[PDB]
Amino acid sequence: TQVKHMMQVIEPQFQRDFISLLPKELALYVLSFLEPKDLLQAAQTCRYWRILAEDNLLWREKCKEEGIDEPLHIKRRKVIKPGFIHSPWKSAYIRQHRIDTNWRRGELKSPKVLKGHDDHVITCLQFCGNRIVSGSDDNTLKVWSAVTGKCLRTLVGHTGGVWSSQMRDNIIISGSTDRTLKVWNAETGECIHTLYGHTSTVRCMHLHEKRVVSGSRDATLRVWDIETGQCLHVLMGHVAAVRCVQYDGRRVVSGAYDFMVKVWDPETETCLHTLQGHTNRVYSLQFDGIHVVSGSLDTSIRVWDVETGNCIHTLTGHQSLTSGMELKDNILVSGNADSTVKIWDIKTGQCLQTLQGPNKHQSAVTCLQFNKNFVITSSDDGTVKLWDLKTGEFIRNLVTLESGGSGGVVWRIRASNTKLVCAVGSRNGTEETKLLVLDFDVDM
């Protein structure tokens, strides 16, 4: 069907070639052994071939290859003569290829500039399907539209600076120096809960479903219910400030300025493990339910087994503070003040790549994002760079602040498959604080 329907309407007759003569099915079995790059060339051979190469099911399986899961059903209208039944899975595959190509060597379209948080800093950034939330030490948060540019709402309520944030379609959560957390309604921008319990600055927080865990400078963590607004548990055991936290709904993992990483079972407010090894403050964490990954001011990154508390790998090589890390499928990427970024396999402990070279960052890496093709890094050098994850090679500078060398800095970045959001500013007055939104979507 569909391919049959095409043969009997276009009528491509008399072909003196191998595949045009083979029973439809066997031609398809054959074409399946080709890679997309080939199917696309083969499709330009002749009308008969083109029709075959468009077999919807040949691509549905080629999309599972690149992990698409969703075919796109495109643009209607007044047909060009001899019709053609396009394959949704094929166009879906091509869309992604063009998007990847747009990021890689596209052509930077000037980004939407979103001015806000004047003469202040952006401490946290959140990006969730069309909505952007910026957090600042000016005591506010602003919900933006990644689509238009406009500020939709400004969450005023905190009496201290905002330093932590989390979000899940319409539910925003903030953590302030005013010692409280606040649950907001992104659409109406109204505060719906104010959580008291912490006595010192609310430094970090991780949200999982209907619960959120916060880490504070009071050396404790609190687990709250985003709906009721109640505090469910209090994790006490840390001696110094809790800088980072991860929560998967089963265990709470935390890193504090006491060089310790603690694994908790919230329900019973009990510390199951205290992970010892780092010789200085632990700033960053990542947790996949099996491995806890910690980054310290001590230069190392440790990989631990959550179940035994046993250290599995001590990843060495960085030279300064590992500020940010991202874990995914046992692949870890770390951003470091030594201006380097590293890609590791936390199963073997191998350091797959170090992102440096002639176009490496000039100062500390402030943030990073990554997927199966690229690594995106931001820095105080005023640039956001795009790197090839597989080769570890530099690709290009997505952003290059003119004031980069004199104050301009990119504090944070959030990337979707189709766009990049950057938090920009400066301590002196060379760069007005704002968000930059780059669009890498394709016309289809």
């Binding site: 800093v121 401490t123 030490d137 201290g160 600076g161 330093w163 120096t177 010192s200 600055t201 430094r203 400078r217 300064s320 503070l321 500020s323 003040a337 100062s363 500390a364 402030t366 820095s379 105080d380 800095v409 504090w411």
Partner: peptide, 12 residues
Amino acid sequence: LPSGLLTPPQSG
């Protein structure tokens, strides 16, 4: 602290 990184000012 490396330039480009932040923390709230000390409270007490």
